[PDB]
Design an enzyme around this catalytic site. Structure first.
Site, PDB file in Angstrom:
ATOM      1  N   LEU A 190       1.055  -1.220   0.060  1.00 25.07           N
ATOM      2  CA  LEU A 190      -0.093   0.020   0.128  1.00 25.07           C
ATOM      3  C   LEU A 190       0.939   1.427   0.046  1.00 25.07           C
ATOM      4  CD1 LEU A 190      -2.854  -1.074   2.224  1.00 25.07           C
ATOM      5  CD2 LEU A 190      -2.654  -1.432  -0.283  1.00 25.07           C
ATOM      6  N   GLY A 191       0.587   2.241  -0.770  1.00 24.37           N
ATOM      7  CA  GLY A 191       1.385   3.374  -0.800  1.00 24.37           C
ATOM      8  C   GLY A 191       1.494   4.370   0.295  1.00 24.37           C
ATOM      9  N   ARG A 192       2.183   4.258   0.777  1.00 23.33           N
ATOM     10  CA  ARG A 192       2.137   5.158   2.442  1.00 23.33           C
ATOM     11  C   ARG A 192       3.555   5.926   2.495  1.00 23.33           C
ATOM     12  NH1 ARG A 192      -2.029   6.454   5.140  1.00 23.33           N
ATOM     13  NH2 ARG A 192      -0.862   6.353   6.986  1.00 23.33           N
ATOM     14  N   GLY A 193       4.070   6.073   1.338  1.00 28.36           N
ATOM     15  CA  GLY A 193       5.285   6.884   1.134  1.00 28.36           C
ATOM     16  C   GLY A 193       6.731   6.112   1.871  1.00 28.36           C
ATOM     17  N   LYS A 194       7.811   6.547   2.077  1.00 26.66           N
ATOM     18  CA  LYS A 194       9.112   5.848   2.147  1.00 26.66           C
ATOM     19  C   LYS A 194       9.458   5.180   3.363  1.00 26.66           C
ATOM     20  CE  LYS A 194      11.687   9.735   4.378  1.00 26.66           C
ATOM     21  NZ  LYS A 194      12.808  10.623   4.117  1.00 26.66           N
ATOM     22  N   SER A 236       7.229   3.785   5.434  1.00 26.10           N
ATOM     23  CA  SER A 236       5.933   2.980   5.771  1.00 26.10           C
ATOM     24  C   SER A 236       6.263   1.368   5.065  1.00 26.10           C
ATOM     25  CB  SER A 236       4.747   3.380   5.203  1.00 26.10           C
ATOM     26  OG  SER A 236       4.828   3.272   3.457  1.00 26.10           O
ATOM     27  N   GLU A 237       6.028   0.532   5.832  1.00 27.74           N
ATOM     28  CA  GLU A 237       5.785  -1.092   5.254  1.00 27.74           C
ATOM     29  C   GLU A 237       4.143  -1.449   5.721  1.00 27.74           C
ATOM     30  OE1 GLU A 237       9.313  -2.757   7.038  1.00 27.74           O
ATOM     31  OE2 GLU A 237       9.741  -3.529   5.144  1.00 27.74           O
ATOM     32  N   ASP A 295      -1.222  11.950  16.474  1.00 30.64           N
ATOM     33  CA  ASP A 295      -0.785  12.033  15.200  1.00 30.64           C
ATOM     34  C   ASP A 295      -2.026  12.442  14.213  1.00 30.64           C
ATOM     35  OD1 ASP A 295       1.088  12.394  13.173  1.00 30.64           O
ATOM     36  OD2 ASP A 295       1.095  10.202  12.936  1.00 30.64           O
TER      37      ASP A 295
HETATM   38 BR1  NKT Z   1      -4.774   1.016   6.030  1.00 28.45          BR
HETATM   39  C1  NKT Z   1      -4.061   1.042   7.630  1.00 28.45           C
HETATM   40  C2  NKT Z   1      -4.586   0.484   9.002  1.00 28.45           C
HETATM   41  C3  NKT Z   1      -3.890   0.610  10.125  1.00 28.45           C
HETATM   42  C4  NKT Z   1      -2.649   1.281  10.254  1.00 28.45           C
HETATM   43  N1  NKT Z   1      -2.072   1.479  11.373  1.00 28.45           N
HETATM   44  N2  NKT Z   1      -1.001   2.057  10.991  1.00 28.45           N
HETATM   45  N3  NKT Z   1      -0.953   2.493   9.854  1.00 28.45           N
HETATM   46  C5  NKT Z   1      -2.239   1.863   9.233  1.00 28.45           C
HETATM   47  C6  NKT Z   1      -2.769   1.524   7.942  1.00 28.45           C
HETATM   48 BR2  NKT Z   1      -1.859   2.473   6.446  1.00 28.45          BR
END
Ligand code: NKT
Ligand code: NKT
Ligand code: NA
Length: 333
Positions: free
Chosen positions: A44-48, A50-51, A155
Site C-alpha cells: 500500500l502506497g504510504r510513502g518511504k 511505511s511497510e 498524530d
Molecule cells: Br490501512 C492502515 C490501517 C492501520 C494502520 N496502522 N498504521 N498504519 C495503518 C494503515 Br496505512
C-alpha cells in the site's frame, strides 16, 4: 521557577481508576502469532518510511491489512499493541485482528481488518459543506472514545483518516504515536507532523493532554473549509509557531506563555514579532465561500486556541451547532 502544572479538563483520572495492567504496556505479554496464516498481496502506497500491505488470511480468504513494525524500541511496539487492544471495537477505531512475527526474520507485524487505502487527504479538498461536517463528526466519535479510554492519538492528520466514501465509513489509523494520559506526566513534544503540531509542542510545554488532538483537528478543519493545505505552512518547527502567531496574534501567545511560566527558546525572540488576532473573514474567497458559515467559523475559533485548557473537548465539539443537521440526520437514519 519551573513551568506551571496542567491537568486535562476531562477524563483526567480514568487510567488511575483502571487496573495497572490496562496502561502499564511495558509489562504486557504478547502471544506472537505466525505470519504463515497470511499471504501479502501488494504494498500500500504510504510513502518511504511505511511497510503497509494488503494481505489475505489463507484460512477464511478474508482481506486484511498488514503493517510490518520496522526496527524501533520493543517498548513502542507493546505501547501500540496495548492501545489497539484497549480501543478494539470503539467507534471509527481501526480493528486489530492479529499480532504475528516472521518465523526467521522475527520482525513483528500488526494485522488489521481490511479498509480501502483511500485517506481523507485524497478526498478532503473536494467534499460538500455537509460531508465535511459529517466526516468531522465521525472523527470526533473516535477521539471522544479514545480520550474517554485514557488515550491521546497525537498524530491526527488527514493521512491517518481512512474513508470509504461510497459506504460513508471512516477509521482513525496509525496509533504508533498514541500514548496513555496520566495527570502530571511530562510527554515527548517531538510528536505529530509539523503542520498539525499544537503550540504546546512548538514551545516545549511537556504536560499536555487529549487537547493536543483537538488542535490537530482544528488544523484539518481550517484546511478543508478554506481550501488551504496546510493552513499553517511553516518552513520548520520555529516558523510553524510564527505562521500560527500571524493568525491567532501575539497577545494571546504571550498570555499563554505567562500563564504556564513557559521558558520560550531564545530563537523565537527575533521571529515572532507582533501580530493582531485576524478575523476569519480574511481567509474567505469565491472558491471556498460555499464551505464557510458563521457556525463553521465559531467552531474553528474554539478549537484553535494557544491555551490547550481553552480548547473544546471532543464531546463539547460534538455538541456545537455546526453539527446540528448531522446529529438530526443520524437519529432519523
Ligand atoms: Br490501512 C492502515 C490501517 C492501520 C494502520 N496502522 N498504521 N498504519 C495503518 C494503515 Br496505512
Ligand atoms: Br503477515 C506477514 C508479515 C510479514 C511478511 N513478510 N513476508 N511475508 C509476510 C507476511 Br505473510
Ligand atoms: Na458562506
Amino acid at each position: 521557577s519551573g513551568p506551571v502544572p496542567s491537568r486535562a479538563r476531562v477524563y483526567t483520572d480514568v487510567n488511575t481508576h483502571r487496573p495497572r495492567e490496562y496502561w502499564d504496556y511495558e509489562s504486557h505479554v504478547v502471544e506472537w502469532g505466525n505470519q504463515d496464516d497470511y499471504q501479502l498481496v501488494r504494498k500500500l502506497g504510504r510513502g518511504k518510511y511505511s511497510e503497509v500491505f494488503e494481505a489475505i488470511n489463507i484460512t477464511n480468504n478474508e482481506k486484511v491489512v498488514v503493517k510490518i513494525l520496522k526496527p524501533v524500541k520493543k517498548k513502542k511496539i507493546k505501547r501500540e499493541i496495548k492501545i489497539l487492544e484497549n480501543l478494539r471495537g470503539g467507534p471509527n477505531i481501526i480493528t486489530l485482528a492479529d499480532i504475528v512475527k516472521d518465523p526467521v526474520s522475527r520482525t513483528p507485524a500488526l494485522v488489521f481488518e481490511h479498509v480501502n487505502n483511500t485517506d481523507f487527504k485524497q478526498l478532503y479538498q473536494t467534499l460538500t459543506d455537509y460531508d465535511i461536517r459529517f466526516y468531522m463528526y465521525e472523527i470526533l466519535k473516535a477521539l471522544d472514545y479514545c480520550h474517554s479510554m485514557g488515550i491521546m492519538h497525537r498524530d491526527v492528520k488527514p493521512h491517518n483518516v481512512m474513508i470509504d466514501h461510497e459506504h460513508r465509513k471512516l477509521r482513525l489509523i496509525d496509533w504508533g504515536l498514541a500514548e496513555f494520559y496520566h495527570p502530571g506526566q511530562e510527554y515527548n513534544v517531538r510528536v505529530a507532523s509539523r503542520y498539525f503540531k499544537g503550540p504546546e509542542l512548538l514551545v516545549d510545554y511537556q504536560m499536555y493532554d487529549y487537547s493536543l488532538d483537538m488542535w490537530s483537528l482544528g488544523c484539518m478543519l481550517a484546511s478543508m473549509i478554506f481550501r488551504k493545505e496546510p493552513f499553517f505552512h511553516g518552513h520548520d518547527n520555529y516558523d510553524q509557531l510564527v505562521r500560527i502567531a500571524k493568525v491567532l496574534g501575539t497577545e494571546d501567545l504571550y498570555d499563554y506563555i505567562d500563564k504556564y511560566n513557559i521558558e520560550l527558546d531564545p530563537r523565537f525572540n527575533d521571529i515572532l514579532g507582533r501580530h493582531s488576532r485576524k478575523r476569519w473573514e480574511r481567509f474567505v474567497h469565491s472558491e471556498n465561500q460555499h464551505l464557510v458559515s458563521p457556525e463553521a467559523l465559531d467552531f474553528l475559533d474554539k478549537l484553535l486556541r494557544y491555551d490547550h485548557q481553552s480548547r473544546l473537548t471532543a464531546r463539547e465539539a460534538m455538541e456545537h451547532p455546526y453539527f446540528y443537521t448531522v446529529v438530526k440526520d443520524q437519529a432519523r437514519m
